[PDB]
Amino acid sequence: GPLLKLFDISILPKSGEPKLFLPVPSLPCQEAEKTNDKYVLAMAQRAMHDVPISSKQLTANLLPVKFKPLLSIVRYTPNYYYWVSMRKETIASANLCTVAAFLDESLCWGQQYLKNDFIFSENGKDIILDTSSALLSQLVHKIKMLPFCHCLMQTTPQDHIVKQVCYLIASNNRILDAVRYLQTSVIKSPIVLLLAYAVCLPAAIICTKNETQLYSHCMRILKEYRPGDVMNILHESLTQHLNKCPSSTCAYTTRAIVGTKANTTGLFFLPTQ
Amino acid sequence: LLKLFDISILPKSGEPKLFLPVPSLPCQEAEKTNDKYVLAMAQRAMHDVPISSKQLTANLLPVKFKPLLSIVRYTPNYYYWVSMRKETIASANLCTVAAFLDESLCWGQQYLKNDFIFSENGKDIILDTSSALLSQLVHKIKMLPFCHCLMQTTPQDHIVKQVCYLIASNNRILDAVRYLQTSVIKSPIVLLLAYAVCLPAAIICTKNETQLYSHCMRILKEYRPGDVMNILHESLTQHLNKCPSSTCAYTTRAIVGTKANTTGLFFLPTQ
Ligand SMILES: [Zn+2]
Ligand SMILES: [Zn+2]
C-alpha cells in the first residue's frame, strides 16, 4: 500500500561533534583480596592480564592442592562483580581458542566441587561457575558460525542433535530443555560431546529439586570429563578437517572463527594432563 | 540406563594442547593501485590503531570512493582481507560492532550514489561481512540487561525480541525485514537493528523480493553518516545517568567494552 513513515525523527540524537568512543560507567576501586597467600595473589595478578596461554598452563593433578587456596578469591572475593564482569567481557568477545580455554578451566573447577562434595547452586557466588552460562552461549555461537562440513564430516555427525541444541540455546537460552534433549541419545559426535560438556554446569546450577533427574545426568557428564578434553577434541577435529575438507574457502572462514590466539584476561589457569 | 558416549570419539591422549591449528597464510600479492592515500589507508587497516586515527568525514568519502574500490572490490587478496575482518567481527565487543556498522552503511550509500547493484557474487570486502555484523549486533543486544530496551520512551520490546529471535535462531534475514516493515520504528534499538539488516537483506534479495529490496533502500537512504555511533553514545549516556541497578553497569561495561578493535576497519565515517 502507501509508503509508511520509516521512523520517528525524535529517535536521533541532537547534532554535535563526531562521537569517537562509547561511554562506559567509571569503575569503583577494588578492595584488597582476603588472602595473604602469595601464590593465590600471584595467580589473581596474572588473571587480570592477557598473558600467553602457555604461561597459564596448570597440570591438572596439581589442581586439588590449589583448590582450597584459590577459593579465597574465586568464592570469597569482595570484588565479585569486578571479576565476573572481567570474565564476561572476555567471553562475550571470545574466539574459539578463548572459549575452549575457559571451558576446560570451568569443567576442571567443577570437578573439584564434585571431588569435595560441594553443591552447585546459583546462590553461592563463584566467579568461575557464574560465567558458565555465558560460555555455553558463546560456544553455541561459534559452532553456528562454522561451515557445516565441520559437523557433517564426522563419523556419526548427529547433525539433528547439533542443530536442535544450538537452536534451543541461541533462540531462548533453553538450557534445561537442551539437557532433556541430549539425554535421549548416546553421544556419538565430538561436537555433541562438546555441547554436553558445555551445558552440564550451567544446567546443574539452575536445577531445582523437581529437576533431580536432569541434575543426575549433568553429574554423569561432569564425572566423565577429563582435564584438557575440550582443547584435545577441538585440536583433533580441526586438524582432521584440514586434512580432508575439499572446500576452497572453508579454511579461511574457519581460521576467522578459531582466531589467532586465546585472550586470557580473566582466565586463572589452562588445565592440562 | 543409556551409555553416555561412544569412547571412540575421544582423541588419543598425547601432548598437552596449548593452541588450536590453523594453516599459515600465503604471501599476499601487491595491491592493484599506486595511489599513496589508498595504500596508506590499507596499511592502517591492517593494524589495531586508535579509532580516532581512522576518522573520515562525510565530505571526503565520496571522492575517495572510486580510489578505494581498487582494494575493496578489486583486491587480489580477497580472502586475506575478508577473513581478517570476519575475525575481528566474530570476536567483537559493541564498540567494534558499532564502528564496522557505520563503515558498512556509509560504504553502501556510496554504492547507491553511483547506481551500483547489490548482490552476493560482486566481491566487496566490506559488504561481504555485513551479515556477520548483523549476527554480532543481535548477539550484543541479547546480552544487554533488558532495562536497556525497556527504558526507552517507546520500547517496542516485542519487536526487538522477535527480530533478535529470527536472526539468532536461524539467520532469517528476509523474515526480519518483513517483520520490521509492518511498523513505524520508535525505539533507537529497533532503528539499529533496521540499519544492520538492510544491506545483508539487500544483497540476497532476488527478483521475487523487489518490495523488500525497496524497503532496504529506503532505510539505507535515510541513514546519516555516524548514526550508529551517535545513537549508541546517546543511549548509553542516558542509561548510565538514569538506571539505578549496580549489576547493570558492570554487565553493560562487559558487553560494550572499553575500546574498539580496528583490525580490518578501513575508516570510521563521521559527519
Ligand atoms: Zn570444511
Ligand atoms: Zn540498566
Author numbering:
A (entry chain B): 145 to 417
B (entry chain A): 147 to 417
Paper text:
ORF57/Mta interacts with PAN RNA via a region termed the Mta responsive element (MRE), stabilizing the transcript and supporting nuclear accumulation. We also obtained the high-resolution structure of the C-terminal IHD from hvsORF57 in both the presence and absence of a PAN RNA MRE oligonucleotide fragment.
In order to investigate the 3D structure of an ORF57 C-terminal IHD experimentally, first we purified the hvsORF57Δ146 and ksORF57Δ153 protein constructs in the absence of RNA and screened with a variety of crystallization conditions using six commercial screens (SG1, JCSG+, PACT Premier, BCS, LMB and Morpheus; Molecular Dimensions). However only the hvsORF57Δ146 construct produced diffracting crystals. Initial phases were obtained from single wavelength anomalous dispersion (SAD) experiments carried out on selenomethionine derivatized crystals in Phenix.AutoSol. Model building and refinement were carried out against the same data, extending to a resolution of 1.86 Å. Each polypeptide chain is composed of 11 α-helices and a small β-sheet formed by two parallel strands, folded into an individual globular domain. One CHCC zinc finger is formed by each chain from residues C293, H385, C389 and C394, which coordinate a zinc ion in a tetrahedral geometry. Residues 181–417 form the globular folded core domain preceded by residues 146–180, which comprise an extended N-terminal arm largely lacking secondary structure that domain swaps, wrapping around the dimeric partner's globular domain. The major homo-dimer interface is linear and formed by contacts between α-helices 3, 5 and 11 which lie approximately parallel to each other making symmetric contacts and forming a groove. The groove is bridged by α-helix 6, where residues Y311 and S315 from separate polypeptide chains contact each other, with the sidechain hydroxyl oxygens of the Y311 pair distanced by 2.6 Å. Analysis of the surface electrostatic distribution indicated that the groove has a net positive charge.
